[PDB]
Design a binder for these strands. Structure first.
Ligand SMILES: [Mg+2]
Ligand SMILES: [Mg+2]
Ligand SMILES: [Mg+2]
Ligand SMILES: [Mg+2]
Ligand SMILES: [Mg+2]
Ligand SMILES: [Mg+2]
Ligand SMILES: [Mg+2]
Ligand SMILES: [Mg+2]
Ligand SMILES: [Mg+2]
Ligand SMILES: [Mg+2]
Ligand SMILES: [Mg+2]
Ligand SMILES: [Mg+2]
Ligand SMILES: [Mg+2]
Ligand SMILES: [Mg+2]
Ligand SMILES: [Mg+2]
Ligand SMILES: [Mg+2]
Ligand SMILES: [Mg+2]
Ligand SMILES: [Mg+2]
Ligand SMILES: [Mg+2]
Lengths: 260, 134, 182
RNA sequence: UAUCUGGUUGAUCCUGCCAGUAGUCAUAUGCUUGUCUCAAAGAUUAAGCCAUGCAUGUCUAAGUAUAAGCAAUUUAUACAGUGAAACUGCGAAUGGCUCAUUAAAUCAGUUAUCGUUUAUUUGAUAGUUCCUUUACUACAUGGAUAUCUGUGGUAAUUCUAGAG
RNA sequence: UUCAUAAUAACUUUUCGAAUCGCAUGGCCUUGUGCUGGCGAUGGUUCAUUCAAAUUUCUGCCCUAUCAACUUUCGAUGGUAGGAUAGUGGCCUACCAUGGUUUCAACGGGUAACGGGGAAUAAGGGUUCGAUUCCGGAGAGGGAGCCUGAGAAACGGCUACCACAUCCAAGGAAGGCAGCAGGCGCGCAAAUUACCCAAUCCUAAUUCAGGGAGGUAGUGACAAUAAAUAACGAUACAGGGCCCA
């Protein structure tokens, strides 16, 4: 009714933030941004709770407005900035660089990376349109647009962005038998090689994905994000190699690691 | 009787505010409470600290006594402290003076008055003068 | 509002309030293990009932199913940690049994009385209430605390307590004063 | 803890229902209430009535400052430091409250927009404006309105006429 | 896809294409105070993007036949054309067609009907309740109509009528507590004209200003949690097994 929703309640919040349901009644609604509200992760949720670099909103504000914080390129003065998938957060202090990549169980794990890989973003191709004058442009999954790409770029393809300039260095063509990342749903953050495509007519297109532990899982192309060749990733993966381990396995791990 | 042993769990260097976020662990057998000022005073040989940039918050006494967990922030400067710390905490410590405004209600009333009127005040005064005369 | 502050009932009241045998049993248990409230017994039974329910559910799922492999095992581990279940007895059938007596025996109220320290259960209760019991270093004034196997040796008088070190109590001071001024 | 007991008879089996019993994250209420952590609370009846007070305003290095306002000392002649006040710019369509409507409507899940609009944020984005196109077009920058100063009118109020 | 886009022909009371701001203040020379040049904020059309928004498809709703046909005057159903709309369409209007829904419950009538998630309830299967912490939706006396704006048919925005009622010097004026407390009234039935923006968070030109949003307490036997109201003492007569009666 009337207009757009400005606030957001600390229960109506997306699950993979793991915010304290009791302390606080409002969550941070991420502002208008590149990624979808459901997929995206705001900075205050990250900075205050994942890293523990702050303890309050005021603290977070202080951290931000002094302009030490940089996301993919620019600083972003606002608190509630949407940072989704594959996004690089470079903090000027101690040069602690991150890429926001999911974990085994679906959380944006604090993955610490050096300036070498934290220089390029991977971006899924949403659509390719010929714009004004007759110019082809490629659309990144983070809303971003790059004008004049490689002509052989289609949808579901993945693209390198050098961050310093809005330019493509290289791309990984969508192929069955190319190592991949899953970004949403019941199966999230798992990694496999893609066995076979299911093309389908009129919406929803599935792909069958197989991991190293011989466990098949089928997922829509919406959540599928190509990382590269089978064997070699283009991005360093979180601890446990980002393979969805069984509950029994987890229990075993717990029972094996009692070290002090 | 007891000199009180202070160790610090979960130590973050924290470069974004130059402060050091750590969990203060106080152990005071026989002694009633920590008394935070004393702890602050102590915190000087611990991290080359000054009684200005030392901050402590939390300090709930654990059940039974003796053990007391808290949370500490040692800044690199007094200046740093007086640009990142909330003012109330500073006031508590004894660094910045107790900031005085008024009662909230009074302020709100003033705001309402301002809203209900237009101008700087001089015009209003003049009008009043004319109403007072006639 | 806030929302997720959920309050659980923790005990079950019996469906028939004057079923005599049951009542007698409860009374006997209270006598044995010093109990202010029948709700304490009821509480423990409710807990046990919950465990039983879980066990039943697990049994319903077939032998060496994933759920059975997980949850049942976890339950067994939990029980071992509390004590209660024997180290030979780790096969779900045992869990289904478990009695009612055992939970009222592996709890501070009884666990203090078990090695001594009190020479009576009511005495033990009083001791627990008045803070002169530590789990190891931490004071517990909960009678139905449930001592947990690893802590089974470290139950002793607190560091800041009479008949366990520290200082004389309120009566001793009075006596001293009297002695001073005679 | 898949449970029942009392009551039709002179006694008996039923059929039955009535009692009791147990719970309420269901009210009210009755006396009694030493504690601790937690904390629902004008929904039900009348979406009935409502006195007063208060619940949306806002400024940075950076849209306007000749407040006849402080400040001024070490930075201040076009201003340079804050900074009320008023315009312009946003925001007041969020939140909060309530359940009278409303029965394939809402709503739930579910598609779709190849059937559309989208301030804002994020990216990208107008080499091409002129008009017979050498006596030409301010681009090394073109014209009047409101804050306050005064005259007020009025039984009054987020009314305000006139002039500069 | 008649898509995107390109290309031609034109067309437009020719939409826009920066007559702005602060901190910086260097490069080279033809020495003009020249041409240059580094960030940073605002602003601006297009296309994506998210926040969305309307619509939308399928499937599912509580009682009643003491509700058997219903809708078509004043669109019911469909066609065709326009109009209107941000866009689709009976969404309007013109004109033709006579359909459409129903006994697999249409249409009526009720409700002590906001819809879910859910809640209570201890086999299984259900029952009954969801006004209420989250999501939708509705409404801001009652109906209506608009304005500004990206975004309302707003309600702490206006406009009128209806009803209830304030202040007046009677000519006129402001109204809307289903925001918070507070009062009246009703009733079985419900709290302080308390304090603070610190936490949570949104809003602003914006770290700084604000927010009875929010939190903190007062009241509080709503329910739930946890547990004190004694603890052992030496005795003085009898137990209960017994060295033997
Ligand atoms: Mg039954
Ligand atoms: Mg008889
Ligand atoms: Mg009955
Ligand atoms: Mg009412
Ligand atoms: Mg204004
Ligand atoms: Mg709302
Ligand atoms: Mg109703
Ligand atoms: Mg048409
Ligand atoms: Mg309902
Ligand atoms: Mg509801
Ligand atoms: Mg009602
Ligand atoms: Mg009303
Ligand atoms: Mg209206
Ligand atoms: Mg409103
Ligand atoms: Mg008004
Ligand atoms: Mg009220
Ligand atoms: Mg009551
Ligand atoms: Mg409130
Ligand atoms: Mg009380």
């Amino acid at each position: 009714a009337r207009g757009p929703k400005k606030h957001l309640k600390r229960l109506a919040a997306p699950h993979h933030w793991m915010l304290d349901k009791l302390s606080g009644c409002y969550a941070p609604r991420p502002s208008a941004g590149p990624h979808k509200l459901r997929e995206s992760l705001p900075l205050i949720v990250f900075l205050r709770n994942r890293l523990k670099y702050a303890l309050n909103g005021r603290e977070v504000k202080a951290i931000l407005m002094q302009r030490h914080v940089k996301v993919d390129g620019k600083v972003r003065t606002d608190t509630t900035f949407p940072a989704g998938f594959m996004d690089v957060i470079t903090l000027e202090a101690t040069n602690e660089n991150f890429r926001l990549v999911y974990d085994v169980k679906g959380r944006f794990a604090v993955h610490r990376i050096t300036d070498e890989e934290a220089s390029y973003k991977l971006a899924k191709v949403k659509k390719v349109q010929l714009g004004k004058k007759g110019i082809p442009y490629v659309v990144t999954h983070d809303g971003r647009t790059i004008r004049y790409p490689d002509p052989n770029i289609k949808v579901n393809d993945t693209v390198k962005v050098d961050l310093a300039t809005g330019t493509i260095t290289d791309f990984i063509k969508f192929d069955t038998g190319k190592l991949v990342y899953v970004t949403g749903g019941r199966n999230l953050g798992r990694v496999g090689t893609i066995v076979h495509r299911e093309r389908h007519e009129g919406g929803f297109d599935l792909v069958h994905i197989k991991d190293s532990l011989e466990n098949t899982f089928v997922t829509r192309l919406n959540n599928v994000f190509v990382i590269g060749e089978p064997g070699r990733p283009w991005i360093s993966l979180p601890k446990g190699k980002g393979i969805k381990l069984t509950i029994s396995e987890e229990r075993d791990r717990r029972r094996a690691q009692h070290g002090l | 009787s007891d000199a009180i042993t202070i160790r610090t769990r979960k130590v973050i260097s924290n470069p974004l505010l130059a402060r050091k976020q750590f969990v203060v662990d106080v152990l005071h057998p026989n002694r009633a409470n920590v008394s935070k000022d004393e702890l602050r005073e102590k915190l000087a040989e611990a991290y080359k600290a000054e009684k200005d940039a030392v901050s402590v918050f939390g300090f709930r006494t654990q059940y039974g006594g003796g053990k007391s967990t808290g949370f500490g922030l040692v800044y690199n400067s007094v200046a740093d402290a007086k640009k990142f710390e909330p003012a109330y905490r500073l006031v508590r410590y004894g660094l910045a003076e107790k900031v005085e405004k008024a009662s909230r209600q009074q302020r709100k009333q003033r705001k309402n008055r301002g809203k209900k009127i237009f101008g700087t005040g001089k015009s209003i005064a003049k009008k009043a003068a004319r109403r007072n005369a006639d | 509002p806030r929302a997720p502050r959920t309050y659980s009932k923790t005990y079950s009241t019996p469906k028939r309030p004057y079923e005599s045998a049951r009542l007698d049993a409860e009374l006997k248990l209270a006598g044995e293990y010093g109990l202010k409230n029948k709700r304490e017994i009821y509480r423990i039974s409710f807990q046990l009932s919950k465990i039983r329910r879980a066990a039943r559910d697990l049994l319903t799922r077939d032998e060496k199913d994933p759920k059975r492999l997980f949850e049942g095992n976890a339950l067994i581990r939990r029980l071992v940690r509390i004590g209660v279940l024997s180290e030979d007895k780790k096969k779900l059938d045992y869990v289904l049994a478990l009695k009612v007596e055992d939970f009222l025996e592996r709890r501070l109220q009884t666990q203090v009385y078990k090695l001594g320290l009190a020479k009576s259960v009511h005495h033990a209760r009083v001791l627990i209430s008045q803070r002169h019991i530590a789990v190891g270093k931490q004071i517990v004034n909960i009678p139905s605390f449930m001592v947990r196997l690893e802590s089974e040796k470290h139950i002793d008088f607190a560091r800041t307590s009479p008949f366990g070190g520290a200082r004389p109590g309120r009566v001793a001071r009075k006596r001293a004063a009297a002695a001073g001024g005679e």
